[PDB]
Amino acid sequence: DQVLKGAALVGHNVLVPSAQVAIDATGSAKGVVAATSAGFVNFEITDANGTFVKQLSVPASAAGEVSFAWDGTDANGNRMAAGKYGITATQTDTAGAKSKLATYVDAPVDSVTIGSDGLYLNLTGLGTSPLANVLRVS
Amino acid sequence: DQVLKGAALVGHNVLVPSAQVAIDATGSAKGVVAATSAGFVNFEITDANGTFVKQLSVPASAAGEVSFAWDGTDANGNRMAAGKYGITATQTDTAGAKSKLATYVDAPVDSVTIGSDGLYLNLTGLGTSPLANVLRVS
Numbered sequence A, B: 001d002q003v004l005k006g007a008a009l010v011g012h013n014v015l016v017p018s019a020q021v022a023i024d025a026t027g028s029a030k031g032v033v034a035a036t037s038a039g040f041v042n043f044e045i046t047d048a049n050g051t052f053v054k055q056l057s058v059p060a061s062a063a064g065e066v067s068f069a070w071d072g073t074d075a076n077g078n079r080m081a082a083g084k085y086g087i088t089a090t091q092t093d094t095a096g097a098k099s100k101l102a103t104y105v106d107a108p109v110d111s112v113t114i115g116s117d118g119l120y121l122n123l124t125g126l127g128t129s130p131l132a133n134v135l136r137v138s
Helices: none
Strands: A013-017 A020-023 A029-035 A039-046 A052-060 A064-070 A083-093 A098-101 A103-115 A118-123 A127-130 B013-017 B020-023 B029-035 B039-046 B052-060 B064-070 B083-093 B098-101 B103-115 B118-123 B127-130
Touching: A013 A118, A020 A029, A020 A103, A029 A039, A029 A083, A029 A098, A039 A064, A052 A064, A064 A083, A083 A103, A083 B098, A098 B083, B013 B118, B020 B029, B020 B103, B029 B039, B029 B083, B029 B098, B039 B064, B052 B064, B064 B083, B083 B103
Parallel strands: none
Antiparallel strands: A013 A103, A020 A083, A029 A064, A029 A103, A039 A052, A039 A083, A083 A098, A103 A118, A118 A127, B013 B103, B020 B083, B029 B064, B029 B103, B039 B052, B039 B083, B083 B098, B103 B118, B118 B127
């Protein structure tokens, strides 16, 4: 099946549901979230223990997709260590109503592996992901 | 395309990436998370403002899927109001290393709608979801 030819993903970038994002030493982690109303969404980055790292805010013209991007630095301008960081997204509509939105992280498909348990994508920085958890190639 | 016959989803349950879960007045919200190591995972339920509601903990024989279930009550045994609640999952492996895991919520596909923007699933309690964000029918 092309459930095999999904090897064409190798070399490209994908969007997968992830509660965390990753950065190397050069920096930058991007992704998107689906806003259900107009307003703004605040993306909070925490560390291993759960310590505050940085916070981003993005306006939302109206319901729809909304992108985010972390430069890999803390609120104090400091470049954080390469590794995986937790990310939480909270929406606030025009009215003040709050809600948690699912985060989708963008990552490069370094390679694909086909083992006994099906086909898996080896996402750079993030790790492993079953071909299926993919939201789309963007 | 059967990208249309995915109307067979109506009446069944699906697993979709969600940062929140929902409960009616009778109760119960379930879902799953993919543990990357053996240990335990703690699911924390928060409210609209972000107030603590309840916390669940589940052991993990080893890397793999792990299910969760909230009875709709707070840590103090109180039945919370019907509605949407935020859920966060944190893994702790045998060693004490912590990590945030992506949450997938199980919800009944009340119906399917096909509009100008493609086909959408009307998930009971959660709301809307584009056919694609679905992880699988379970």
